[PDB]
């Protein structure tokens, strides 16, 4: 093929033009987001059953829904969660390769089967089926400091939300604030005065506020001669508080007409009163924008900001908008980094190429070829339906160097031939390509063989690996294709003949550098000869190095991804059980001031109502948005340091309750991937007390008598809290007319809200809710003052037929796969593999009697599967590489000399990571490098590059021996010939990775990990290879 295109440069140019066009078109039509989808599909239920406890919610709604979910296609596991908030959820997780849309529709169709078996109020509110996946883009905040949160929420819902979701690329907008409602606050004392009940109020509201459907005049089956038809309309609904207050509750014979406005206060309000939000200590209304699949994050964020700026003109006085967090900035920074690294690599390639080949037109070929290979990779990525995100951009950054090598090799070989034999560029190119074409083909085959396995892993980790695998493989393939077609054509066309008979008698810098590099090459050849003369000792040394490197690699920590400074910290506040929202708000104000005391924090968002532990009036959390990375570069201004400072301040300041500041994992959708998560099921339905006792026993077994770092072993729920228990005498209640259902309605309307009807409010329907005055539902003694009607219709207080006492009850309940369950966390003690700890806990669970099982959750479900998949994939990769090399060399034993370089790269990488960890420990910084995903990617990259260099050396050595040279002489000549290109590529690649070694700022943790691994692996592997590969060749030839 190379000879074909050496004579047809314009055909090669046309092919490259088509490649460029395909790449441009692919870039134009690629989705853009910071991260791809890596988690499995999940469907949630989210039912509301007001005024209920965890046990009631669970048994009456969640178990009933759950029992009709065994049978949906591709279901892995299932869970339930109930708290004291009056709402709960059922979460269904699905096996990968399951269509999320089909799963959602099937779950909805299963829910429609049992919907009628739920409580009437649950059906009134409805159950929302949705998919847990969220393509979160931004938060939009409106702050006034003048008008209440009701006004801001209404204004947002009426003006801002509809405008944002009409923008291109927006998939969903969610308002973090309650809608408006007509609230009736009943005073039970007045009700008892008039001998009325909450049921009467609800019935009157429903009867006197209803839609009327009249019809038309002159409908179709009309009498003869009818000429006019008209629609008849009557309005039977109320729309103002004054109209609602005039509802007649009892039309007395005398005409007194007891109205609704003399037993209750009627006014517009909200529908939750549960959660409140603030921004730097002032009232706010938050909105969340979610990008649509196939949407561009940067364009959508810019359009949203423009729309908000335009809409700002019409805000009421005092209202302003702000967007404190945005995910498009990360991908923008990643793309900018890609462009900057590409420019720097081009500059460095130009510099080294001009330094070595002593001409300016030699530098033109890599510049042309590398961008075309990148564009071909982009085209392939678009064809496969992927997107532009951080991982793919990192893959581009890392593959730039290898594609640069693929061209340096050809250009250097051609220049050597031209300077040596004095041939014209066309003949020299023909000779060089005839020399290296088969080696190029074999090298690309080997690279594909080594990279394909990374696309065969399973789970979220496999999804993460697939990005790198596909992007890099496509780029490598296109680079090889270009090196076989366009690079030789460019070499034969744009180069000029070296003056014949010239010995490069240069002057000044060029002559001096030529002499010094020739001395270096001669010295290198002498050292290689010394190494070759004594072979047994060098083989012993190589085995020692390989063993030490393997040992270092094994003794490395295992992790998934390193925590990154994403620009914010989270705070979770928890107060003693039974605390009220007022105390929590005071603590939140304290936390806000403490955050204000820290310069590194830009904005603080506090939300009351729920925490990391769960929901409740004693729960709260905050989001602290940090300043820009540029403004935070000194020591102690990173996310971890800010979190530590905030935690230290909180532990000394806050009086009631405690707060903790942490940083989230790198990917929010993918939960924490650290620790051991345990689900303890109850198979026999013994009860809550038995399961709690068993959980305590298991915690003791794990902590006191196990290997689990006792500090981290703790329960992941919410301990029991005191509750009020009403005991009703059946006989006493039956003696009067109380029917136990009048009790239900009375309590449901008194101690909790009641949803009665629906009314129009300037174009949109909103709920009517009856909740009873706050003065009658504050104290335990108020419970027995409530009244319930008799059969005769008289009001009788609950005191006569009931008693109340303080008890202990559950605050939250969870089921796992259809059984009552508890959740536990843990972590290995030290140097303990997860496998043996999991076996230990399995044995402990077995020690507990039958009826109590175990189940892993989250990442532990995947970690239960052994690491055999990785071993098998790498073994198959090695076998494929061996077969490809055997085909290339037409031998069975020569390929062995190329496989022996794998330990060199492995040792280099492991030693670099260990050394940088130790150095950071000396500096006082905690360790931050592990055998994580980025380590594996970098190891694969350096291993491929080392394999390429070894393959070229062995190819050159084999041919020289066939000509007549001995094995040792052939090896010496091959090393002497390959010295220069290897030096050039190593210099370029190492200095191009250096920036990733000192990376700092956004996503800099992964950058630093890759930089360390690649830099040290490449340096050490190349240093050992340039001395040991000839030894491998000589040994393999002698032995066989």
């Amino acid at each position: 093929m190379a000879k074909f295109f050496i004579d047809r440069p314009i055909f090669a140019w046309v092919i490259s033009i088509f490649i460029i066009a395909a790449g441009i078109f692919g870039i134009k039509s690629l989705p853009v987001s910071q991260y791809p989808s890596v988690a499995a599909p999940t469907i949630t239920l989210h039912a509301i059953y007001p005024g209920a406890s965890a046990q009631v919610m669970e048994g009456s709604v969640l178990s009933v829904i759950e029992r009709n979910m065994n049978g949906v296609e591709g279901l892995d596991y299932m869970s339930t969660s109930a708290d004291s908030s009056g709402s709960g959820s059922v979460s269904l997780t699905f096996t990968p390769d399951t269509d999320e849309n089909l799963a959602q529709v099937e779950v909805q169709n299963k829910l429609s089967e049992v919907l009628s078996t739920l409580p009437a109020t649950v059906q009134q509110y409805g159950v929302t089926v949705s998919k847990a996946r969220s393509n979160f883009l931004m938060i939009v905040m409106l702050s006034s400091d003048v008008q209440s949160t009701e006004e801001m929420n209404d204004y947002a819902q009426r003006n801002v939300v509809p405008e944002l979701q009409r923008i291109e690329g927006v998939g969903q907008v969610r308002l973090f604030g309650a809608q408006r409602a007509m609230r009736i606050w009943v005073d039970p004392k007045k009700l008892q005065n008039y001998n009325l009940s909450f049921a009467d109020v609800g019935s009157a509201l429903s009867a006197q506020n209803i839609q009327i459907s009249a019809g038309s005049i002159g409908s179709l089956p009309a009498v003869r001669g009818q000429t006019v038809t008209a629609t008849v309309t009557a309005q039977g609904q109320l729309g103002t508080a004054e109209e609602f207050g005039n509802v007649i509750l009892r039309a007395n014979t005398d005409g007194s007409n007891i109205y609704l406005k003399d037993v209750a206060k009627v006014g517009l309000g909200m529908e939750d009163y549960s959660s409140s939000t603030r921004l730097n200590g002032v009232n706010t209304t938050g909105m969340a924008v979610m990008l649509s699949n196939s949407g561009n994050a940067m364009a959508t964020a810019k359009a949203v900001k423009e729309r908000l700026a335009v809409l700002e003109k019409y805000f009421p006085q005092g209202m302003s908008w702000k967007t404190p967090y945005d995910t498009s900035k990360f991908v923008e920074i990643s793309i900018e980094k890609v462009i900057h690294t590409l420019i720097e690599a081009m500059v460095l390639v130009f510099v080294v190429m001009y330094l070595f080949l002593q001409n300016i037109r030699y530098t033109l070929i890599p510049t042309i070829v590398v961008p075309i290979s990148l564009l071909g990779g982009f085209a392939f990525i678009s064809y496969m339906g992927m997107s532009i995100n951080v991982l793919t951009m990192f893959a581009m950054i890392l593959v730039i160097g290898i594609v640069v090598d693929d061209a340096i090799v050809v250009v250097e070989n051609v220049e050597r031939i031209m300077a040596g034999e004095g041939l014209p560029p066309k003949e020299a190119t023909k000779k060089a390509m005839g020399q290296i074409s088969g080696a190029v083909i074999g090298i690309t085959a080997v690279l594909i063989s080594v990279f394909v396995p990374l696309a065969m892993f399973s789970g979220a980790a496999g999804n993460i690996y697939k990005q790198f695998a596909l992007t890099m493989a496509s780029s490598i393939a296109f680079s090889a294709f270009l090196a076989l077609t366009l690079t030789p054509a460019l070499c034969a066309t744009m180069l000029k003949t070296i003056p014949k008979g010239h010995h490069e008698e240069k002057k000044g810098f060029f002559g001096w550098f030529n002499k010094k590099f020739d001395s270096w090459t001669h010295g290198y050849e002498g050292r290689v000869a010394k190494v070759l003369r004594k072979t047994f000792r060098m083989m012993v040394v190589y085995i020692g190095l390989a063993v030490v490197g393997v040992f270092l690699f094994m003794r490395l920590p295992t992790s998934f991804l390193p925590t990154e400074d994403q620009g914010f910290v989270m705070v979770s506040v928890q107060l003693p059980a039974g605390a009220t929202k007022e105390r929590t708000d005071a603590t939140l104000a304290q936390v806000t001031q403490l955050a204000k005391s820290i310069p590194e924090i830009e904005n603080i968002i506090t939300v009351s109502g729920f925490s990391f532990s769960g929901s409740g009036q004693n729960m709260a959390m905050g989001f602290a948005i940090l300043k820009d990375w540029n403004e935070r570069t000194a020591s102690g201004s990173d996310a971890v340091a800010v979190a530590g400072k905030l935690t230290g301040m909180m532990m000394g300041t806050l009086k009631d309750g405690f707060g903790i500041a942490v940083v989230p994992p790198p990917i929010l959708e993918l939960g924490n991937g650290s620790g051991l998560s345990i689900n303890l099921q109850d198979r026999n339905n013994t009860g809550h007390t038995a399961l709690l006792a068993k959980r305590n026993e298991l915690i003791q077994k794990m902590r006191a008598s196990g290997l689990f770092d006792p500090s981290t072993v703790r329960a992941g729920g919410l301990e029991d809290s005191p509750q009020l228990k009403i005991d009703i005498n059946r006989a006493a209640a039956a003696a009067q007319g109380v029917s136990f259902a009048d009790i239900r309605t009375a309590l449901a309307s008194a101690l909790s809200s009641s949803y009665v009807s629906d009314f129009p409010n300037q174009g949109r329907l909103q709920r009517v809710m009856v909740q009873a005055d706050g003065d009658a539902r504050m104290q335990p003694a108020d419970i027995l003052n409530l009244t319930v009607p008799n059969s005769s219709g008289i009001a009788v207080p609950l005191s006569s037929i009931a008693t109340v006492s303080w008890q202990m009850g559950t605050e939250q309940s969870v089921r796992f796969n259809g059984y009552p369950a508890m959740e536990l966390s843990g972590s290995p003690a030290t140097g303990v593999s997860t496998g043996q700890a999991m076996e230990a806990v399995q044995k402990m669970v077995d020690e507990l009697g039958s009826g109590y099982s175990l189940e892993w959750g989250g990442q532990s479900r995947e970690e239960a599967k052994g690491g055999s998949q990785t071993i098998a994939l790498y073994a198959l990769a090695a076998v494929a590489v061996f077969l490809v090399l055997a085909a290339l060399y037409e031998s069975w034993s020569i390929p062995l000399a190329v496989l022996l370089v794998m330990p060199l790269g492995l040792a280099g990488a492991a030693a670099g990571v260990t050394g940088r960890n130790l150095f950071e420990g000396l500096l006082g910084s905690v360790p931050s490098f592990a055998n994580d995903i980025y380590f594996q990617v970098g190891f694969v990259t350096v291993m491929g590059l080392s394999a390429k260099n070894a393959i070229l050396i062995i190819e050159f050595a084999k041919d020289l021996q066939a000509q007549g040279k001995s094995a040792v002489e052939a090896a010496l000549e091959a090393a002497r010939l390959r010295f220069r290109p290897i030096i050039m590529t190593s210099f370029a690649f190492i200095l191009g990775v250096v920036p990733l070694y000192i990376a700092g700022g956004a996503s800099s943790a992964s950058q630093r990990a890759i930089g360390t691994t690649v830099f040290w692996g490449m340096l050490i592997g190349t240093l050992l290879s340039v001395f040991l590969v000839p030894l491998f060749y000589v040994v393999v030839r002698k032995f066989f």
Binding site: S87, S89, S130, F176, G609, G614
Partner: peptide
């Protein structure tokens, strides 16, 4: 609106 709150805190529960 309890459902929206339920969604937000379930996600938060998972991360930490």
């Amino acid at each position: 609106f309890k459902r929206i709150v339920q969604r937000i805190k379930d996600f938060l529960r998972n991360l930490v």
